Design an enzyme around this catalytic site. Structure first.
Site, mmCIF file in Angstrom:
data_model
loop_
_atom_site.group_PDB
_atom_site.id
_atom_site.type_symbol
_atom_site.label_atom_id
_atom_site.label_comp_id
_atom_site.label_asym_id
_atom_site.label_seq_id
_atom_site.Cartn_x
_atom_site.Cartn_y
_atom_site.Cartn_z
ATOM 1 N N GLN A 42 -6.059 -17.612 -3.171
ATOM 2 C CA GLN A 42 -6.074 -16.809 -4.429
ATOM 3 C C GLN A 42 -7.242 -17.250 -5.322
ATOM 4 O O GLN A 42 -7.938 -16.353 -5.864
ATOM 5 C CB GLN A 42 -4.733 -16.902 -5.169
ATOM 6 C CG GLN A 42 -3.606 -16.105 -4.520
ATOM 7 C CD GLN A 42 -3.901 -14.624 -4.516
ATOM 8 O OE1 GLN A 42 -3.854 -13.958 -5.545
ATOM 9 N NE2 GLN A 42 -4.256 -14.099 -3.351
ATOM 10 N N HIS A 61 1.780 1.584 -5.751
ATOM 11 C CA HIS A 61 0.360 1.151 -5.843
ATOM 12 C C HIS A 61 -0.514 2.329 -6.303
ATOM 13 O O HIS A 61 -1.375 2.130 -7.179
ATOM 14 C CB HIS A 61 -0.085 0.537 -4.514
ATOM 15 C CG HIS A 61 -1.544 0.256 -4.443
ATOM 16 N ND1 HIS A 61 -2.148 -0.696 -5.236
ATOM 17 C CD2 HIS A 61 -2.513 0.777 -3.668
ATOM 18 C CE1 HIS A 61 -3.431 -0.756 -4.944
ATOM 19 N NE2 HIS A 61 -3.686 0.164 -4.011
ATOM 20 N N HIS A 86 0.844 -1.221 0.000
ATOM 21 C CA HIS A 86 0.000 0.000 0.000
ATOM 22 C C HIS A 86 0.870 1.259 0.000
ATOM 23 O O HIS A 86 0.722 2.086 0.893
ATOM 24 C CB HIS A 86 -0.998 -0.021 1.146
ATOM 25 C CG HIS A 86 -2.121 -0.967 0.924
ATOM 26 N ND1 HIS A 86 -2.179 -2.192 1.546
ATOM 27 C CD2 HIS A 86 -3.219 -0.873 0.146
ATOM 28 C CE1 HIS A 86 -3.282 -2.809 1.171
ATOM 29 N NE2 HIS A 86 -3.937 -2.015 0.315
#
Ligand SMILES: Cc1ccc(Nc2cc(C)ncn2)cc1
Ligand SMILES: [Mg+2]
Ligand SMILES: [Zn+2]
EC number: 3.1.4.17
Length: 313
Positions: A269, A72, A68
């Site tokens: 995932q 990003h 983050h």
């Protein structure tokens, strides 16, 4: 006014594609962003000196966390650029302005922890904002930087255009709360399928911009496999640190955030692609057909994660 940003030939061409990776050269990212504003919005949208000072204050207020971070912010803004460039006539002047800025600012001052961990920690921000805790903080940080002297990039707008663009940015940033995405996408699905979706209805536009913000925010899953796979390591580096901080509070973290359960990552995932990513890009492709390449790339990456599970890699 006559000062264009130009990129090297390979970037100039690849920046137009959804699956573009902004590269490891941090000092080129401001110039990449300005290039996108100039082509997406116009060379006149912003005073270059104010924009450059806004960008560098935004950069300074992103932290050195694994995922983050400033990379990003720029990656999410590039995905919005790709969507806007492929849907030229669908968006107002104010929207194109607002949405690239919203994307750059959407995770301002992120500490690498979820809204859940802030609430369990009893962080001061959790008492100030009961829901969408970090996202209300990201919008607050954006307004704070816009109010620094020499930083108000919207100064040329009328009073009503100014309130409209800050309202576009507020909703766009709040919409990056994944907890709000599930209900937003279901509503958009129903409206598209029953044929009631109406882009002249402001409530409907808000919903469609929200889905675009989720699409851009998740766009790590729409890159070429080597990019998607290496970005997953940074994502899980944050999740595992949050898991460690949960254990320090005397709370067993969910398996996704537990570094003792790395083996379960491939299956986690699959769940994420099927429950979040694929549904997100499917609805987006139905509403904005030219974003199909995001859905196609997401499907290709789901197939790569299936191969990881079968031991083929
Ligand atoms: C807070 C947050 C939410 C979603 C993502 N994107 C993800 C998530 C997962 C599980 N796998 C791949 N990409 C990153 C951070
Ligand atoms: Mg966020
Ligand atoms: Zn984000």
């Amino acid at each position: 006014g006559l000062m264009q940003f130009t990129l090297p030939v390979r970037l100039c061409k690849e920046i137009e594609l959804f699956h573009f990776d902004i590269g490891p050269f941090e000092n080129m990212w401001p110039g990449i962003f300005v290039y996108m504003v100039h082509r997406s919005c116009g060379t006149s949208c912003f005073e270059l000196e104010k924009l450059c000072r806004f960008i560098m204050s935004v950069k300074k207020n992103y932290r050195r966390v694994p995922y983050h971070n400033w990379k990003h912010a720029v990656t999410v803004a590039h995905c919005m650029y790709a969507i806007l460039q492929n849907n030229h006539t669908l968006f107002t002047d104010l929207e194109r302005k607002g949405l690239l800025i919203a994307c750059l600012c959407h995770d301002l001052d992120h500490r690498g922890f979820s809204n859940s961990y802030l609430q369990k920690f009893d962080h001061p921000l959790a008492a100030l904002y009961s829901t969408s805790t970090m996202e209300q903080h990201h919008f607050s940080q954006t307004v704070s930087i816009l109010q620094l002297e020499g930083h108000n990039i919207f100064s040329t707008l009328s009073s009503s255009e100014y309130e409209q663009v800050l309202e576009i940015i507020r909703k766009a940033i709040i919409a990056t709360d994944l907890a709000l995405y599930f209900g937003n996408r279901k509503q958009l699905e129903e409206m598209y399928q029953t044929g009631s979706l109406n882009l002249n209805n402001q409530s409907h536009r808000d919903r469609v911009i929200g889905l675009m913000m989720t699409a851009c925010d998740l766009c790590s899953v729409t890159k070429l496999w080597p990019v998607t796979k290496l970005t997953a390591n940074d994502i899980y580096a944050e999740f595992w640190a949050e898991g460690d901080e949960m254990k320090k509070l005397g709370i067993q973290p969910i398996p996704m955030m537990d570094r003792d359960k790395k083996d379960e990552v491939p299956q986690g995932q699959l769940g994420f692609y099927n429950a979040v990513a694929i549904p997100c890009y499917t609805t987006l492709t139905q509403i904005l057909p030219p974003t199909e390449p995001l859905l196609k790339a997401c499907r290709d990456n789901l197939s790569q994660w299936e191969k990881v599970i079968r031991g083929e890699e």
